[PDB]
């Protein structure tokens, strides 16, 4: 009962983003409250997805319905691809990275980008030579590698080298300052473990919980996992037809957890 995009050439890097977007509650509520809705590529995305999804419910005329679903979904995927193509310089057959494409897609519309932009500082001190810094940034997708075993959004540290003396395995830490309604991170080697409830956090009184994950399966295929209302999970694997697959638990190996999406909750 959850329609999804079918594979087209190398586009799973885009498919995983589109599935994350159309299942986001905060994105939906913002899009419906936009001035000049029809002018928004995100309005068009959510509207066309909803029409395809409604068609799929209608399905349970078969050949006509599935033709309409494909044309509907392919049209809005192609519109978004063409919007990104000048910046990624990509063809449909080129393998790309959602880590590169997601921030560029958000930047297309400031009212949507604002949902994702958080402020933080990178803090670093070298135990060997004293080199230290605190650098403030505002971003929509930060990348982590070599995280500490006990990594947590409220203790978001990783190992890295000193640029002054080249000592290895110093500590660099993301210190959150202001968190957006949607908060996303990229993990090069996944998370230390895959029990996602552990990574929920409060910040300035608001609860953030993980609502979707992009899996990097077998280092060659992106698949989006969506948390449903009753606690089950939807796997959107574009190689598996028009409908998504329901799972009771969340089954991504920890090392394949690529992009993690938290959302602010009541």
């Amino acid at each position: 009962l959850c329609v999804q995009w079918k594979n087209a050439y190398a586009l799973c890097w885009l498919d995983c983003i589109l599935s994350a977007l159309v299942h986001s509650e905060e994105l939906k509520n913002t899009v419906t409250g936009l001035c000049s809705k029809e002018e928004s590529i995100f309005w068009r995305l959510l509207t066309k997805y909803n029409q395809a999804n409604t068609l799929l419910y209608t399905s349970q005329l078969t050949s006509e319905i599935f033709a309409e679903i494909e044309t509907c979904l392919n049209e809005v995927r192609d519109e978004i691809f063409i919007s990104l193509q000048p910046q990624l310089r990509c063809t449909l057959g080129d393998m790309e990275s959602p880590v590169f494409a997601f921030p560029l897609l958000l930047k297309l519309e400031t009212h949507i980008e604002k949902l994702f932009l958080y402020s933080f500082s990178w803090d670093f001190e070298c135990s060997q030579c004293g080199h230290q810094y605190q650098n403030r940034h505002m971003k929509s997708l930060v990348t982590f590698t070599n995280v500490i075993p006990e990594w947590h959004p409220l203790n978001a540290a990783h190992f890295g080298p000193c640029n002054n003396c080249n000592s290895k395995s110093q500590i660099r830490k993301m210190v959150l300052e202001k968190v957006s309604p949607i908060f996303m991170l990229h993990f090069v080697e996944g998370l230390p473990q895959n029990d996602l409830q552990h990574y929920a956090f409060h910040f300035e009184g608001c609860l953030y919980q993980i609502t979707s994950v992009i899996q990097y399966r077998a280092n060659n295929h992106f698949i989006t996992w969506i948390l449903d209302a009753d606690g089950s999970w939807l796997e959107c694997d574009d190689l598996k037809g028009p409908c998504s697959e329901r799972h009771k638990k969340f089954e991504v190996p920890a090392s394949e957890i690529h992009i993690v999406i938290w959302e602010r909750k009541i």
């Binding site: 190398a10 790309e96 990275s97 590169f100 670093f124 190992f159 640029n163 660099r172 060659n220 992106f222």
Partner: protein, 79 residues
């Protein structure tokens, strides 16, 4: 002739000098050698956009002391 920083995801920053119209290939190769990384295994980005070995700082409008981001390649989807 300008200075370019290459910033990795572990927080490393290495600085290099290069001429405005020289292809970024010689810089991407030098960085691979310094860090022990395979060239086929990394991807570079400037101003949020992926860059090629054939691009020059002149084409990309790189000013001196600009930063290039570098990532372990994690692309898809195979078909």
């Amino acid at each position: 002739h300008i200075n370019l920083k290459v910033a990795g995801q572990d927080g490393s920053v290495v600085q290099f000098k290069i001429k405005r119209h020289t292809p970024l290939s010689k810089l991407m190769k030098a960085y691979s050698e310094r860090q022990g990384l395979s060239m086929r295994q990394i991807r570079f980005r400037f101003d949020g956009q992926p860059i090629n070995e054939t691009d020059t700082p002149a084409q990309l409008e790189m000013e001196d002391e600009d930063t290039i981001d570098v990532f372990q390649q994690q692309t898809g989807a195979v078909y």
